[PDB]
Amino acid sequence: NLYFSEMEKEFEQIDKSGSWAAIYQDIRHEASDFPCRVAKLPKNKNRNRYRDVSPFDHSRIKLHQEDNDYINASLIKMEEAQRSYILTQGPLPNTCGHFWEMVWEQKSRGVVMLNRVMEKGSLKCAQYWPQKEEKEMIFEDTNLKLTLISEDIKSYYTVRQLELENLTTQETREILHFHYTTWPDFGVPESPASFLNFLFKVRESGSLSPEHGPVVVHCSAGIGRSGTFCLADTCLLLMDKRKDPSSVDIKKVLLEMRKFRMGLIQTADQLRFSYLAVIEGAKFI
Ligand SMILES: [Cl-]
Ligand SMILES: [Cl-]
Ligand SMILES: [Mg+2]
Ligand SMILES: [Mg+2]
Numbered sequence: 714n715l716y717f718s719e720m721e722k723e724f725e726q727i728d729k730s731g732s733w734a735a736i737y738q739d740i741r742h743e744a745s746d747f748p749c750r751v752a753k754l755p756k757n758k759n760r761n762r763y764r765d766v767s768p769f770d771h772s773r774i775k776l777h778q779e780d781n782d783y784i785n786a787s788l789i790k791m792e793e794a795q796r797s798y799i800l801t802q803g804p805l806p807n808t809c810g811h812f813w814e815m816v817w818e819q820k821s822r823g824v825v826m827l828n829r830v831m832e833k834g835s836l837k838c839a840q841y842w843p844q845k846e847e848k849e850m851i852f853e854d855t856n857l858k859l860t861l862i863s864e865d866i867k868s869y870y871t872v873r874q875l876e877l878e879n880l881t882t883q884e885t886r887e888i889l890h891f892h893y894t895t896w897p898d899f900g901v902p903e904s905p906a907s908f909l910n911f912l913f914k915v916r917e918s919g920s921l922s923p924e925h926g927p928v929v930v931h932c933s934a935g936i937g938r939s940g941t942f943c944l945a946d947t948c949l950l951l952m953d954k955r956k957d958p959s960s961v962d963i964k965k966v967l968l969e970m971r972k973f974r975m976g977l978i979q980t981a982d983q984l985r986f987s988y989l990a991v992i993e994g995a996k997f998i
Contacts, residue, residue: 719959720995724988737981740964744971747771757783760811762802766934772973774799776811777818778855784811785935787974788927789943791966794950797927798943800974802935803828803838810852812841813859816888816929817879823920823928826892827938837898837933842875842890856880862887869895869907872914891915896938899979901986905993908986912946913997921946940977944970945990952991953998963988 715722727733751757752767760783761767767785768774774786785808786801799819804812816824830838842859843850849860858880864873873890893911895903902908915921920928932938944967951966952958967987971977978984 718992720961720963720988721992724992727988728985733981733985736964737978737984740967740971740978740984743968744975745968746975747972749773749975751783752785754783756781760805760808761785762805763934766802766936766976768974774801774815774819776814778811778814784808784815786815786929787935789970789973791947791950791970794947794954795923796921796947796950798946799927799929800935800939800943800977801929801931803931803933804841806839809839809841809850810855810857812929813852813857813877814855817857817877817886819929820926821888821920821929822886822922822925823889823891823915823918825915825920825928825930825939825942826890827896827930827932827942828898829894832898832933838931842873851880869893869903870911870914889918889920891918891920896932898933899937899983901941901982905986905990908945908990909994909997912942912949912990912994916946934976934979936974936976937979937983940967940970940974940979941983941987941990944978944987945994948987948991949994949998952995958995961991963991 747769749767751770768787772787775782786799789798828837830840843861846861851858858878860876862874862876870893875888877888878885930939948961948966951961
């Protein structure tokens with residue numbers, strides 16, 4: 714034991730001992746297991762990108778769809794932090810209408826995308842938003858229209874403004890799309906600093922406010938990178954809210970989060986990064 718924050722000491726002690734992979738295995742072994750029956754139904758086979766990544770039945774988002782209410786998406790509700798997120802897979806070509814249906818129904822203001830459509834030659838996500846202002850998208854199945862209004866491209870991420878219209882009612886909403894383009898699969902962001910700039914931009918937008926529905930967060934499978942993002946955010950929230958900042962047990966927060974969706978944080982290095990981002994981020998809270 715060393716005495717000279719509680720979070721920082723844990724980190725150094727873990728980093729010296731090199732037990733990230735071990736602690737990460739603890740989390741894996743200790744993680745909740747709940748059924749995903751609806752997800753495994755034969756008729757939902759083509760709504761899942763990966764057959765080993767499913768939403769738990771209890772926390773899955775249901776489409777207000779007359780036909781089939783299933784989407785591979787989970788509500789993560791963090792009670793003390795008072796923040797909610799929808800974590801979802803990268804939409805598939807046949808589930809883009811569902812994806813935007815969910816955004817609409819859940820009254821989300823932001824979408825946070827943590828992957829690229831193509832990574833190392835592999836398709837990770839459908840092109841679910843318009844890349845060009847002049848070519849808008851219509852989703853006929855769910856009766857939605859989607860138009861790129863503007864985009865602000867930076868080195869490590871892009872922010873877009875989209876206009877989502879419910880064609881039935883002709884209501885329109887502005888959705889903000891926060892796209893971190895330099896976070897490789899099973900990897901970590903280019904640096905904690907760039908990650909936190911991104912996070913603070915999402916926050917400053919008001920997208921994570923209780924005034925709106927839960928932000929929709931996705932990567933490819935909606936667990937590794939998305940898990941890292943949310944865990945960092947929630948931990949920083951708890952530090953601000955609590956009289957004791959150093960009381961925030963990152964491992965325990967992650968396990969709580971894992972009660973709502975499987976596999977959040979997919980490598981030991983992502984775990985390490987999340988600790989790192991929270992410590993560095995704590996300065997700015
Ligand atoms: Cl919480
Ligand atoms: Cl695809
Ligand atoms: Mg419930
Ligand atoms: Mg143009």
